[model samples]
Target: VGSLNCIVAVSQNMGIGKNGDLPWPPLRNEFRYFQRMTTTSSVEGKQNLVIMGKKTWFSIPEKNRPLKGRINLVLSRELKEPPQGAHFLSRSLDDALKLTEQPELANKVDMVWIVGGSSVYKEAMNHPGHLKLFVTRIMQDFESDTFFPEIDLEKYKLLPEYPGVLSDVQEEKGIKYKFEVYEKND
Candidate 1:
């Protein structure tokens, strides 16, 4: 986060569960991992902000809607105020950018992470920022038409990778995964 500046997330085209449930802690861990990398080198007093489209913001269950530590920035072309504790209510991505540009908020902020649903992810990737990606590679492919952007390999390069075995699947349930980081070259 510290000076990493921005984050644009894309999704993998897949779905599982009874209807639409995320696979266990992968989703939650994904957030935690991003938080660490984003703020790892920050000064003591700074924090990061998270920006997401309206639907994406609401998709998070009521219990986890506003994550602690990081400021919640809800981006919407409509919507008078954020649900409850959301810190910044942006009418558009540009508005969100402008808010981050404010001198008062600038010094205290480290970066703005874009978390998303389909349309939001697609739009976010076009903005200027660093990219941190987590791919939950699964074996039996599921059905999903939505996907994260096809990040241009030439524009970004991998930073590092953390691979581990998944111990939470059904039987030990044997699912495996890894976290990958990518930074823009230009």
Candidate 2:
């Protein structure tokens, strides 16, 4: 079975975005945490797949459009083709996920990472697949309009500190946060 991992950073109130952007300044280590988890894979010559919704892709700078070391897949019903520089496009989360199973692409991808927007993140959580949540719990609250959905604790159990994933509190630009992992019982 393939693993669908949801990686997100939420504030004290589970806030993830403010005005279509991050509420706080860039936390390099927090970002590195995301980059490393998504980019690294056990199999050689295989890369990770990063999925996102239309707005989330557009909000990022065009210069940084395609996330490095990962195949970028954007889910959009309105677009007939993938966005400029994006590798693939699909109508829904399920459709995008299907691409990962294609004979041509299946072996090339070692992991499927759901990278944000409340809608995308919400759908992935509901799918009956092996999903692990790599959550960054920001210790401070910010003015946020978008928030991550509450994960069902009964279905997913929190695990102790993982290797290469810092469980200790991290501070950047006066903002403190901790990396946490929630794995499904399966």
Candidate 3:
């Protein structure tokens, strides 16, 4: 299986959500970056696994729900089945990861990409596996009730540059932001 990864956008205060939604306006450049990263893999003929919590799943506009080009796994215990348009459903983050090893998905999944609400991230961060965080840094402040978790410096190191991520700052629709990649320390 590919390494476990987290993909999120956070504001200056590390705030990720305001009223269970994006705090800032959409930045299509980074959106494309996210789409491209989660959809493509180094190896050929394998799909990526994108896992999100219940709220995160619904947060995505219905029209754009069931993100294209990857395996969408919705994490929820209440839902008896996968949400409409979502490929699969798991009760917990741990359960979701285990799916990659189950025979049917084992050969198909290349990576586990965690996208979502605060707690889902905490669960993903607790793992000792090769974890990579694909974070989008939003430079401005915004109103938010939820925040991104503090990175454990002892466990992860920020890379200076990554193949597809931009090193310098980017401006979109008057918002300034940049892409960052953090992986477990060797």
Candidate 4:
């Protein structure tokens, strides 16, 4: 079974976005960190999968769509076909997970990353297959209409350090943030 993970950046108040885009100023390093994480895989000859909601899929600029080097799987109940550059389309979160087991994709996929909009994040968190959370915790708060779902700390234990992850809080343009991982014990 492929590991399912989520990657998100949130403000102190757990705000994730405003009007479909990032609410805070762009953090170049943080963006790169996201790029690296989703693209990385331990197994040679394998790639990762990024699953996101329809709105989240559209939020990315056309040039950046599909995110490069990974399979882009968009969740949409209304769409009849995959969006431009998307490798696959699923009607639901469960359908997307099933894609990971398909013959053409099973051996090729090493992990599944749930990249989001609010609804996608909510569904992914409740998914029985969910494994870990990769959260970029921003130290400051901003005015945001969209917020991340409240994480249940009791179910997911936060790790102070993770392999291949930076262990310290980072500051960029005077704003502070940290890369945090929460794991669910099986």
Predicted candidate 1: what Cα RMSD to the true structure? 4.7
Q: What is the Å distance of residue 151 in model 3 from its true position?
A: 1.0
**Each prediction's whole-model lDDT (CA):** 0.57, 0.88, 0.88, 0.89
TM-score, cand. 3: 0.95
Candidate 1 — which pairs collide? 1-38, 1-39, 11-148
lDDT of 4 by residue, 1-186 (tens): 668899999999989989888888889999999999999987898999999988888888788988999989999989999988899999988888887998979899998999997888887887774489999999999889889999989988899789989978899989999999998854
Winner by TM-score between candidate 2 and candidate 1? 2
Candidate 1: what lDDT?
Answer: 0.57
Candidate 4 similarity to native, TM-score: 0.95
> What global local distance difference test value does model 3 have?
0.88
TM-scores, one per candidate: 0.72, 0.96, 0.95, 0.95
lDDT of 3 by residue, 12-102 (tens): 9999988867998888888889899888876788889999989889988899878987999998889999999999999888888888899
CA shift of 184, model 4, Å: 0.8
lDDT tens digits by residue: candidate 2, 1-186: 257899999999889988888888899888888889999986898999999998888877788879999999999999999999999998999887888999868988988999999999988888886789999999987889989999999988898978778777889898889999998845
Better of 1 and 4 by TM-score: 4
Q: Kindly report which residue stretches of model 4 are placed more than 4 angstroms away from their true locations once superposed.
A: none
